Amino acid sequence: SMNFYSAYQHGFVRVAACTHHTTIGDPAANAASVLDMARACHDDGAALAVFPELTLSGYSIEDVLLQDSLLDAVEDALLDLVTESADLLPVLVVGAPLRHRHRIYNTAVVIHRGAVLGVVPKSYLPTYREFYERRQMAPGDGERGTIRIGGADVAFGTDLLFAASDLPGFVLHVEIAEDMFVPMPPSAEAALAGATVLANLSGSPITIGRAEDRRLLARSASARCLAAYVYAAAGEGESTTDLAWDGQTMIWENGALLAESERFPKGVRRSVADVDTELLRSERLRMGTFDDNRRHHRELTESFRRIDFALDPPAGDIGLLREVERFPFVPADPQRLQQDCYEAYNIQVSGLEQRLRALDYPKVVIGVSGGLDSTHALIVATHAMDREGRPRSDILAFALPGNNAIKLARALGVTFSEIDIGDTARLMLHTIVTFENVQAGLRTDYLFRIANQRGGIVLGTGDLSELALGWSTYGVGDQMSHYNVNAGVPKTLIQHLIRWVISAGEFGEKVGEVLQSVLDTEITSEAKVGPFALQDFSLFQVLRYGFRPSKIAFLAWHAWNDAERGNWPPGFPKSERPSYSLAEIRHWLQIFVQRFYSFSQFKRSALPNGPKVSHGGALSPRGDWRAPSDMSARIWLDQIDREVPKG
Amino acid sequence: SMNFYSAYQHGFVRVAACTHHTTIGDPAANAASVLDMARACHDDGAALAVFPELTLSGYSIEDVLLQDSLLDAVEDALLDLVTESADLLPVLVVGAPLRHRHRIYNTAVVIHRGAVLGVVPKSYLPTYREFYERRQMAPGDGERGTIRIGGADVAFGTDLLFAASDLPGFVLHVEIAEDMFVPMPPSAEAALAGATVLANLSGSPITIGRAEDRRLLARSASARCLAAYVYAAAGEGESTTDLAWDGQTMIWENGALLAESERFPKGVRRSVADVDTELLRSERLRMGTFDDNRRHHRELTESFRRIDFALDPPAGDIGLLREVERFPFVPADPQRLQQDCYEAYNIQVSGLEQRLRALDYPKVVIGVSGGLDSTHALIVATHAMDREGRPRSDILAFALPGNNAIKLARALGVTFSEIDIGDTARLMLHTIVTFENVQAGLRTDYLFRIANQRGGIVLGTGDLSELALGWSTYGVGDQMSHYNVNAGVPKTLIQHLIRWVISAGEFGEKVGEVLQSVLDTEITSEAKVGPFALQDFSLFQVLRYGFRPSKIAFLAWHAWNDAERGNWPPGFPKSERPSYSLAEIRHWLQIFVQRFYSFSQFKRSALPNGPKVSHGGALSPRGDWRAPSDMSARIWLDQIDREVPKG
Amino acid sequence: SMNFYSAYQHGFVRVAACTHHTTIGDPAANAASVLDMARACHDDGAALAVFPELTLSGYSIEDVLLQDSLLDAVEDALLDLVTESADLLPVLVVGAPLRHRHRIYNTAVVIHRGAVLGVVPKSYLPTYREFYERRQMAPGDGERGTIRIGGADVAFGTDLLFAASDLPGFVLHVEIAEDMFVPMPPSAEAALAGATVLANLSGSPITIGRAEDRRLLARSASARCLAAYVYAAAGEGESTTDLAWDGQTMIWENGALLAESERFPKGVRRSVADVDTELLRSERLRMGTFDDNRRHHRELTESFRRIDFALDPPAGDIGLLREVERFPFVPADPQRLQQDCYEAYNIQVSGLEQRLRALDYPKVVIGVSGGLDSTHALIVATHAMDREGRPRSDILAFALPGNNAIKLARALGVTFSEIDIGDTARLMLHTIVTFENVQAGLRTDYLFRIANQRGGIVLGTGDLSELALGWSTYGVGDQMSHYNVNAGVPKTLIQHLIRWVISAGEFGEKVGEVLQSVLDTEITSEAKVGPFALQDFSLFQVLRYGFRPSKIAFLAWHAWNDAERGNWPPGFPKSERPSYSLAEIRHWLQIFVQRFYSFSQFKRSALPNGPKVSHGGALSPRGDWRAPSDMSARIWLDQIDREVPKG
């Protein structure tokens, strides 16, 4: 029933930061650039278009700001833009010097569908180094009430929110340039009062290092305020009597850069991106201290004035202007991925180290199959022992048949032994896929018994994705161990941790050759539960954000349906770059929500210790995931039936 | 009279962030680690030592926090540390769960010289994902009054400042972990109330990406709050039942990282750095909107309680724990420098572009000597013309004799002409170092006359360092031009902009060969005014911070006296790495303050347009530097006589 | 499209202060005098008519105020005036004792178009010396709410503003007599709250010195409150049992007297004047501390009640009731002009003195052409040298040919030398109106070279009007000098400074004869840029107030079109009293806005030091005028095309 391909119906809001062509001291010309860009934003289906500080006059005109003809021309141009907006989709946020009471104010005028919703004055006017703003303009901090524009009294002040009544996830707040650089910025109080999209109009003459400063402050605002931050600075056309300009625009969301434009461009530029209002909503739902901070500042935050507007956004397929990683646990960017792998590995190792110290260095018993998970756990166990100054021969590795394993153990210098469970199984199957659980259980039973006998503990090797799907023999089974270093690591990341270890090369070339052989042999269960690439994608969206299934399918389809779009991490030869149809994503998603929400929780409910690894979450019922073991997944399956097309 | 080699006498404060060895549930053991580290901080002359969240109990002990024997043992250990501090220099900030009224609070105890100065509870206790803090502990936001510790009632609450009565630049405020992550952090209000050093005790279980998050928030706090930010997280010893720890510590100052320690270390680590309290003071003096923000929140900021203590810091030579760049305008880090050069060049080019458009593309007249400055200006002029779609033959370059110049002009395809001023000079010297000003003036006179005749403007090529020192023939002279693209660029950066242009290679190999020849010929005036490396060093300290001369000499001596210490930017063969004695630095500094404060302002007072380039400042009297043309430098010279040793 | 001849369309508001004929204790008679005067105000197109304190009863009637028949008769008369006002243009402000709650109040009733807008009680009732007011009447300070008049509840209190909704520059506030004499008058808070026109109804028995006291307080109110102040006192008809009355009325604007009436008149009198609401608006726009004062008293100023009314003023030519000086820099009044010239001369001299001291008394090099500007600068240079005890022979004066100059230098006893640039020019024009810039440049080049050679500085002589219009050879040119004493002095004032110096006679009769010869020869460039009388007129309006071009043309046409109207300063024989048509004023104004806003700023952007002289402004880019060097004057030219008739 929803239009599945509509970004607006999935909770996105399309927003634009625009750098126009400045004609200093010519408001009709600045307005014609603005209108042209605003029409491009309309054609793109954008809900918001933010322009540079003092758009209609030029930022850089100093005492010209005070000339009656300049100020009159700004009013005439502004009113003409307002009439134009009757036919434009986006809210426009346009800068203007405007008269109010005794002075002119440096303002952002918020315009929508033929009306002015509000006028927001800059709160802090720098008057130091290259800035002289208090000479021409009055501070807006603490100003409230209304301003008279074109025959209407409209809201004026630095306490205004603009809330889309048909898009509750979109609540706009506006501030100007210096306002975001002070210790207590107006946007931070507005975020706590309910703003989700924070706009900044900037003039910002460019000097060496200044772009880094803008980025630092806008990025950290977006993170600390669990918000999108939409920034536009002035560019070509501002006076270069004493100053230069780079026209930078950028869009941040919760600390992530969604889009940015060319610095020092020839001609106008825009950043345009779909902000996920549900991502912002999900972060604020979970981070309770955000709301405790609002309650601490209740008087400050409860008094904002909320001005309502109806956006009436396009209902159809307008694409999705957003990078959606195929692997939420495996960043495509190589530098970022190296860092993640470094971090995961040390998490795993230091976790195990603390366990070994607290137990006065037991021997470590571990089942090794030659598979990715147990290969990597053995490497972790080895490094933990090395760092604790303990002999590698205190590692007791067991192959348990019902290849690369013995090679790897021999290359590491750990104690390797191979017990054949075939026979004990047989006497079991007699005294009482059955076949295949008896084996799994007898593996575990043995490992524990040897650990008892040898003064050791059992290290587990099962991974987070297996925990998510309940892929595991419950009880006496592979979940059970004294400490599982892989419990927090999703299957999709495991191969990269191994690659990272090989690249490290800190184990020497023989060990690297065996690990490489493991990767080559294992990479090329997924037949029952489907591709781990898709199941790890849904696990992240559910565990981090609680997104509904149709939202997850939509993100997954944009990431995965076309192998040529987007980016792939390192380690994917062209031939190993699969693409998935919506029918496939839908199928594996029905299996995901059933197994995750309903079937699998009981198996997780009694997990072994092991460290949390991913910022996306782990599944410890002592930690990130508290849930009932006895619930149906009916509503999630029904949501898929209702909202995700069959193909 | 001061001890010139004393970092404390130059306004530094030495601060330490420490990660100790956690013994969970054993306060006597945690306190013994703390005391050992605190004694190391004492030996280092540190004024402050901050430890991880809940130091005395362990952060990670969950319901064990509520056990009477744990809480009793924390009190006994805390009191014993307090008695120990009688003999230690630094203020210690140690975490503890402490009983107050109905509940325990997650606290930082601030300890100095045998007394507890104050107890600061955490304001926001996360209870989401891996955090369960509201289960055991009460929120401290809004709590005031006193807490009873060891027979004394001491200040308790999240409104405390600790001010060193003998070191006014050191005013401490403390917050804990999550407190810095909310939209309106307690430290931001404390900065506005007067805090200059903000401490954070953190537990912070480590996950992929989390260190980047800590960095983002601590760095941007330090920048937006014009403060130092001292952060310590827990490491080895915390429980790894569900979580891992990386022991990270770091020290930020105004957005710059001063120090950080090894992640996931074996054993304890500290970051130790000298914070420049005068840098923080100078930034706050200049950025008036910082204080406007305090006045907006007057009620909030005026009610902090200030607790005084006397530090009585070491008076002798304890070195300087701080990286002091030799070239404040030329970052040693290659990536940072590439960025700076990219930015300067585009500033210069786009500045000139706007001037050319506004004048309907005049011809551009430029004097070319073959020197660094005029070589680079000709490159800028060329690129500006290219970008504006204008013919290079509209550039009119003139050699004016009284080599690489004609080569470069020919290689660029601009119009080159060589006028010999020898003869006109002669008739001048007759009709009325004199010799050598007549020449300089006749150069200018000609250039303007040709510009008039040819429908053009004169581009200036003099640089910022020449403006700073008044190295220039005033009037009809080389200062005068229609637009100076070099006016904002200090001499020390010029050579690197040329190198950057060569590396760009966007002009082709012939032009690159000529530029390289310019560098080789020119690099190897400074005999009258001294080394530009030293004069640019002092210019930055004066223009950005207004530091007194003894402070400038001290920084310069630490940067420059030993060629083997510190880092050099790219482009300095081993043989070109000079070192300077204090006697030399003192000599050039006396010349600097006389020329800068007294002699040179009149020549700057009428400068041509050109863009500001460096975040350090430019010298436009319309911009960064407003000063009288008729003042003595007596007090600065006297300060040198009184406070800088002769050698 | 505007009616150019309409004072209302140019932002004037016509206001009247009226002294009526008092019939003590006869309200019908007082109302008939009021109505007669109000009809005269209507016929004059006045927007406001203010009457004396207690108009309807008589001020002086003491306990008769308390008689029921007196109070009833006041109500009946008041209601009848109110019905009459249905047909009158002006707001009427009429005094009445009115019952409210327990007492009568001394009130001003504000009446407009058939309704009572508000009733304002006197705040402070003097009861000392001849005043007994608290005996009969209650204080109004702090009273709010409404009063019942003629079946309507209307606003009552000392917090009322009356704002013309179709004339935003007209916001009225009313106070009574003693209210303006206390340290914190109600009108001062009303000005900060937005009042631009402050009315005072006064009874004010007249004694020796009292008129001076009224003037002092009303004048300084109008200045400190950047407002018009409209004052009317009672006259004939008040009881002379113990007191006399002088019927004074006056209208002040920003410290200037606009109009006043005959003291002790036989019959009624009115002051009627057009208040420039744009002048008040421009002063408040520029004086930021006025608004800082409002923000300091925010609670006080934000709570005024604003009562709106539509004036619907006459749209046609009603003349202009205002003295508009032909020379904003040259007051017509001889005493005022002598003072201005005394002040300018000492400004110039003391400026130069400080420069000479700071440079340890250099020789002073100056180009002397015999013209007004260089003649006067040489006199200034001479007096500065005399005052500093320095020999006149240290002045080095140069004639530079391409008469009165050598006479004047010889008469002063300075060192005179005549260099002929003819020849050096020639060799210049060869090595490369051109002709005529080469000369100007060679003048400058020489002067600087001689200054270098002789241990001196170059004094500039160019004037403010030349700076305004960019009349000057940029660069090496006549702008350039070490110190310009004329930089702040407009051309129109220069001749009067010379006349003043002659009258002083402090140089002796020979020098006076030469100066007189200079005036006679020079007085009788203006062919390219037009009459300096018109260009200085526009410069003042732009620099002081930022008025739009049509407003400037309107003022200039009223000042200049008829030589017989208005006043001329001293020094204008009948034959030298030009008049200008609107077509001429329009033509020179188009040239003015193009040169001033667009063409000329670059030449000013690098000005030499020199002191600000006129309260109207100077053009130092370090001082009064910060503006871009690269802006178009399109909007000002377009404003002229749209709004100023061709002739």
Swiss-Prot record, chains A, B, C:
Keywords: ATP-binding, Ligase, NAD, Nucleotide-binding. CDD domains: GAT_Gln-NAD-synth (cd07570), NAD_synthase (cd00553). L-glutamine binds at Y128, S204, R210. Residues 338-647 are annotated as: Ligase. Residues 13-277 form the CN hydrolase domain. Its EC number is 6.3.5.1. InterPro entries: C-N_Hydrolase, C-N_Hydrolase_sf, Gln-dep_NAD_synthase, NAD+_synth_C, NAD/GMP_synthase, NAD_synthase, Rossmann-like_a/b/a_fold. Residues 607-626 are annotated as: Disordered. Pathway: Cofactor biosynthesis; NAD(+) biosynthesis; NAD(+) from deamido-NAD(+) (L-Gln route): step 1/1. One of its GO terms (molecular function) is ATP binding. It catalyses: deamido-NAD(+) + L-glutamine + ATP + H2O = L-glutamate + AMP + diphosphate + NAD(+) + H(+). The active site is at E53 (proton acceptor), K122 (for glutaminase activity), A177 (nucleophile). Transmembrane segments: none annotated. Deamido-NAD(+) binds at N437, E466, W471, S472, T473, Y474, K603. NCBIfam families: PRK02628.1. In the C-terminal section; belongs to the NAD synthetase family. Catalyzes the ATP-dependent amidation of deamido-NAD to form NAD. Uses L-glutamine as a nitrogen source. This is Glutamine-dependent NAD(+) synthetase. It comes from Mycobacterium tuberculosis (strain CDC 1551 / Oshkosh).
